[PDB]
Ligand binder design. Sequence first.
Ligand SMILES: NC(=O)c1ccc[n+]([C@@H]2O[C@H](COP(=O)([O-])OP(=O)(O)OC[C@H]3O[C@@H](n4cnc5c(N)ncnc54)[C@H](O)[C@@H]3O)[C@@H](O)[C@H]2O)c1
Ligand SMILES: NC(=O)c1ccc[n+]([C@@H]2O[C@H](COP(=O)([O-])OP(=O)(O)OC[C@H]3O[C@@H](n4cnc5c(N)ncnc54)[C@H](O)[C@@H]3O)[C@@H](O)[C@H]2O)c1
Ligand SMILES: O=C1OC[C@](O)(CO)[C@H]1O
Ligand SMILES: O=C1OC[C@](O)(CO)[C@H]1O
Ligand SMILES: [Mg+2]
Ligand SMILES: [Mg+2]
Lengths: 342, 342
Amino acid sequence: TELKGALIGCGFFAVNQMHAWKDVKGAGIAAICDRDPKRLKLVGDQFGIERRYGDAAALFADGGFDFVDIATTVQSHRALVEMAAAHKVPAICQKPFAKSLSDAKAMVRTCENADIPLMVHENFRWQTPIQAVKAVLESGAIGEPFWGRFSFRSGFDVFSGQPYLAEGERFIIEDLGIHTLDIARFILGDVATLTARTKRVNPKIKGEDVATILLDHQNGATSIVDVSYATKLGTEPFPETLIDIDGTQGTIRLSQGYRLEVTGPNGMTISDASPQLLSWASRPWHNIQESVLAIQQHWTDRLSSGGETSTSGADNLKTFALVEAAYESAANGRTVDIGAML
Amino acid sequence: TELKGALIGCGFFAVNQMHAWKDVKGAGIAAICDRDPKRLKLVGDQFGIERRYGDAAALFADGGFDFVDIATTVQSHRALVEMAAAHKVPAICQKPFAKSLSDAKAMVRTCENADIPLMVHENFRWQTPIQAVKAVLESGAIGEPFWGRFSFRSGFDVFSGQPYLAEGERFIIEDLGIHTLDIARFILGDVATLTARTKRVNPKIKGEDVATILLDHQNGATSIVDVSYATKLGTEPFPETLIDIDGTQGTIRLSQGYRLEVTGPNGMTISDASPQLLSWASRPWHNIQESVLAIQQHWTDRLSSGGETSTSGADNLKTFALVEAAYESAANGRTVDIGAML
Ligand SMILES: NC(=O)c1ccc[n+]([C@@H]2O[C@H](COP(=O)([O-])OP(=O)(O)OC[C@H]3O[C@@H](n4cnc5c(N)ncnc54)[C@H](O)[C@@H]3O)[C@@H](O)[C@H]2O)c1
Ligand SMILES: NC(=O)c1ccc[n+]([C@@H]2O[C@H](COP(=O)([O-])OP(=O)(O)OC[C@H]3O[C@@H](n4cnc5c(N)ncnc54)[C@H](O)[C@@H]3O)[C@@H](O)[C@H]2O)c1
Ligand SMILES: O=C1OC[C@](O)(CO)[C@H]1O
Ligand SMILES: O=C1OC[C@](O)(CO)[C@H]1O
Ligand SMILES: [Mg+2]
Ligand SMILES: [Mg+2]
C-alpha cells in the first residue's frame, strides 16, 4: 500500500530527505545508493535501511521500488534520470537540475517519452513563509501585483558543509539564485526578459558571490532578485528570503524573522509566517528542512492522484532558463529574451 | 558683509527657499519676481520684500543683487540662466535643471563663458541622513562598497501641492528619481551604464509613477534605484529615501524613521540620523526643508570663498544624463552607455 522509494546520493543534504521520508505519510525509503561506502554505511545505519548499493546500475537492476530520489551533485543527474526513465521509475532530481538548459530539455523529453513523472526537488517555494506570501497575493488582498523584490543577502559560511561551492567559476546564481528566481516565478509568474550583473567579493573562492537581476514578468510586473554571500550584517538572516510586493491596492512585506506585513484597503495586518521546528530539524536550517517534508509529501500525493507536480521537470526548465540567461547577461551586459531560449 | 539675492518664481516651494534665505548667514533676499501677481503679492507680504517685479527682464535691468535664485518650473530655466549669464549674476537653478541634456549643456557652457557660478538646487544629498551615509562610507567603516539600493516608495498625494506632476507624459523619474539618482552618484560615484523599467499604475495621471533602475558604477559597484508613488504601505514613509550599502568589510542600512545601522569588523552601531525641525518647517517636509537651508548656506559660503558648489551645473549634467538615459532605456528595454551622452 505504501510507496517504496530508492534514494541515490547519501550526502550532506540527503540526511534531511531521509528524515522527511519517514515523516511522509504514504511513502518510505526501501533502498539507498552511494558511490562512497563510508557515507552509504553512515546513512544506512542512521535510518535502518537493509538494501544498500555501491552503484545505481545495480540498484536499478534489482528494482523493487516505485520511485527514485536523486540527491547527488549535478554531475550525475542526466545519467541517473535517464536510468530512471529507461526502467519506467518515477524520479525526483535535486537542484541544480542539469549542467545546462540543453541537458535539462533532453532529460525532460526522455521522461515524457517514457511516460514517467519527473520532479525537480526545488524546495524554497515550499517554505511556509513563501507559501504564505503566495496565499496573500492569490487572494486579491493587494490587487494586481506590479513590482517585487526577492532578496537573500547573507554572510554565512555555506562552504564548510558544501565545499564544492567555493570551487567552480559559477557559484551564487547556480547554487542559491536558482531558488530566488524560482520564487520570483512562483509569486509573479513567468519572465519575458532578464538583465543581470555579477561580482566576486570573497577572495577565498573562485566563483561570483553577488548577483543583482532585473526581471520583466509576462504579466507586466517588474522585479528585483538580489542575492549575496558577502553581506556582513549585525543579524545574520541565513537562510531567509525576504520578499516585497507592491500591488494596485496594497503591499506585502516579508521581513527578517518571518514577519509578514500586509497592507490593503481595509488596514494593515502583521502575522508570524515562521516554520514549524520539526523534531529532527535544527536552527537556522529548520525553514529549509520543513520544506523538504512539504515537497516530498506533495510528490507522494501527486503520484497517487496522477497529476503534474509544482516544480516538475517541464516547469523547472522555465526557472533554469533564467539562471542561464543571468550568466549570459552578466558576461554580455545586455538584456536577454527568455522566450527565445525555451 | 551682506549678499543681496533676487528670487524668480514665487511658487509653492519658493516659500521654503525664502524662509531659508532668512536663516542663511551672510545672505538675504532684496527682490522677488513672478508673472502671477497673486503669488508676487502673497510672498512679498509674507517675507516683507519691497522690490517686486512682474517680469525677470525688468528685474535684471534694475540690478542691485549679487545672485539670482530661480525657483520657477522647468520651462523658464534656460532663459533665466541665460539672462543671469549675460548680466554676470551668479545663479541658482531649481530641478529639473533643463528639459533635455542638450539644453543643460548649453546652459552650463554659457555660465562658464560668462565666468559665473551656476548651482542646481538639488537638495536631497544635503539631507542630514544622506550626509551621514556619505560620512560613514567615507570613513572606511565598511571597506570598499560593491552594492547599493536607493529606494523612495510612497503613496503620498504630491499632486495636490504640485498639480503639474499629474499632467505630463513624464513624471516620477524627472521629478523624484532625479534626486535618487543624484544620491546614487553622490554615494557610489559616477555611472558607466544604466538600464531602466517604468510603469503607470495610477489611473488619474498621464505619466509613469513607478521606475526601477539598475546602475553599473565606474568603481565597479552595482546599485538599484527604485522609485514609486503607487506603493501603499502601513506607515507612509514620505519623503524618506532608504539606503542599503554593502561593502567588503560591512554594511550600512538607512531604514525608515531615519535609523542608521552600520556593521563593521568591530561590530554594529545604531544611530538616529533624524533631521532637525526648524522653526518654519512642517512635518513631514522638515527633512527637505532643513536641506534647503543647508544647500543655500553652502551656496553662500562658496560664493564668498570663490569655490565650486557640490551640485554645480557642471556636476548636475552627470545626474541629468542618468534621468534622460533611464527614459531612453525604459522605451528600448536596452542598456544605455552614459559615457557616450556627455
Ligand atoms: N535546499 C536544497 O534543496 C539543497 C540544499 C543543499 C544542497 N542541495 C543540493 O543537493 C545536491 C547534493 O548536495 P550535497 O551537499 O549533499 O552533496 P554531497 O557531496 O554532500 O553528497 C553527494 C553524494 O552523492 C554521491 N554520488 C555522486 N555521484 C553518484 C552516483 N553516480 N551514484 C551514487 N552516488 C553518487 C557522493 O558519493 C556523495 O556522497 C546538490 O546538487 C546540491 O545543489 C540542495
Ligand atoms: N526638493 C526640492 O528641491 C523641490 C521640491 C518641490 C519642487 N521643486 C521644484 O521647484 C520648481 C517649482 O515648483 P513649484 O511647485 O514651486 O511650482 P509653482 O507652479 O508652485 O511655482 C512656479 C512659479 O514660477 C512662476 N514662473 C514661471 N515661469 C516664470 C518666469 N519666466 N518669470 C517669472 N515667474 C515665473 C509661476 O508664476 C509660479 O508662481 C519645479 O521645477 C520643481 O521641480 C523642488
Ligand atoms: O539550496 C541551498 O540552500 C542553502 C544552500 O545549502 C547554500 O547556498 C544551497 O545549496
Ligand atoms: O523635488 C521634489 O521633492 C519632493 C517632491 O515635492 C515630490 O515628488 C518633488 O517635486
Ligand atoms: Mg514514511
Ligand atoms: Mg539671511
